[PDB]
């Protein structure tokens, strides 16, 4: 009914790490085109959109559209039982089966995960400023400014992008110039909650690069490309 085989089994491990703490429960949308997951966090301030195209899988088989409601911490627990060199197969539809086949040992792990019945349109948009920067740098900026304040002001201009925070200790401004690529059509200045961004940055191991797309009074998009397999997008509603 559904059989997805991934040789780079650690992609799926890093994917669940980047979601489990931000989203507790999500519906995995399975079809012939691949695996999709879209979910807001419990506060509806952020939304994750995950796409894993069928072509990114080494084997992919799906004869009907599936909506598998998954407790992402239960799925994270099972995926921790997989080694980084394992071949992971997803299979189904009252349970999701995960099969971990050892790279070079005669060891097969078979996990059967209870599902649960879990019962938004992301409109196409252009953005004024699009910043592409190293993922580890964005992770550091978000972690570092978390020591200063709870909100970060992202000001983008032709020269570059500035991340600013303020609190009791004082204030901080991190300026990146220009690999930092800035496709700018209109300077923007938006304020976001650092706590959510520090959840998004758990996707950092998925991609050496991160893309921020911003426009006046619209959600920030924090985008991690997943090899040649898909993407993990985080949307963050602005403040004010």
């Amino acid at each position: 009914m559904f059989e997805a085989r991934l040789v780079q089994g650690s992609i799926l491990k890093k994917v669940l790490e980047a979601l489990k703490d931000l989203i507790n429960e999500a519906c995995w949308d399975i079809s012939s085109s691949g695996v999709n997951l879209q979910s807001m966090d419990s506060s509806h301030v952020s939304l994750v959109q995950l796409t894993l195209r069928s072509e990114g899988f080494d084997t992919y088989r799906c004869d009907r559209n599936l909506a598998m409601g998954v407790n992402l911490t239960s799925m994270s627990k099972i995926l921790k039982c997989a080694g980084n060199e394992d071949i992971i197969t997803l299979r189904a539809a009252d349970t999701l089966a995960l099969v971990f086949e050892a790279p070079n040992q005669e060891k097969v792990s078979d996990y059967e995960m209870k599902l649960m019945d879990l019962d938004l349109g992301i409109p196409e948009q252009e953005y004024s400023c699009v910043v592409k920067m190293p993922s580890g740098e964005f992770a550091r900026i978000c972690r570092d400014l978390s020591h200063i304040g709870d909100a970060v002001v992202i000001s983008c201009a032709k020269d570059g992008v500035k991340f600013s925070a303020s609190g009791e200790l004082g204030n901080g401004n991190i300026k990146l110039s220009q690999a930092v690529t800035i496709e700018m059509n209109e300077p923007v200045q938006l304020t976001f909650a650092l706590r959510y961004l520090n959840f998004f940055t758990k996707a950092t191991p998925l991609s050496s690069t991160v893309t921020l797309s911003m426009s006046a009074d619209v959600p920030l998009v924090v985008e991690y490309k997943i090899a040649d397999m898909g993407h993990l997008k985080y949307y963050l509603a602005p403040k004010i």
Partner: peptide, 9 residues
């Protein structure tokens, strides 16, 4: 002053 996703999507 935190807005939410549904307001934009």
């Amino acid at each position: 002053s935190q807005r939410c996703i549904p307001e934009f999507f």
